Amino acid sequence: GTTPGELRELTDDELKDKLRESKEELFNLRFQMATGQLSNNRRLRTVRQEIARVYTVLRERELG
Template identity: 75%
Template sequence: MRELNDEELVLRLREAKEELFNLRFQMATGQMDNNRRLRMIRHDIARIYTVMRERELGLSVSPDEVPSGEGAA
């Protein structure tokens, strides 16, 4: 997740939320085969939010913002 840039994170978040919606719908109608998938998607969403918050606070940087002058004095 951390190697994705901000736009890719937003896209991945949107896809995960859509899948979560569909899985909840399947669960309500009794068509769900894999209950574990619901939990995995929720954890992925939490991971994405965590990475986004870390970048917002400056605790980590996106791959686009990697300093180019590493090692230069």
């Protein structure tokens, strides 16, 4: 839900915070999907792609 653009003003530690918050979110809605009370399915994909985006930006910061 957040463009990779506005992830470049965030430092390493707060990018890491964003990433762990997102991983916790993903665990929660994975449980909700398993128990049957998640109707919105595209939420899983968006959060999974957000995690991938956060790693991508971190690696780009490391290398250049």
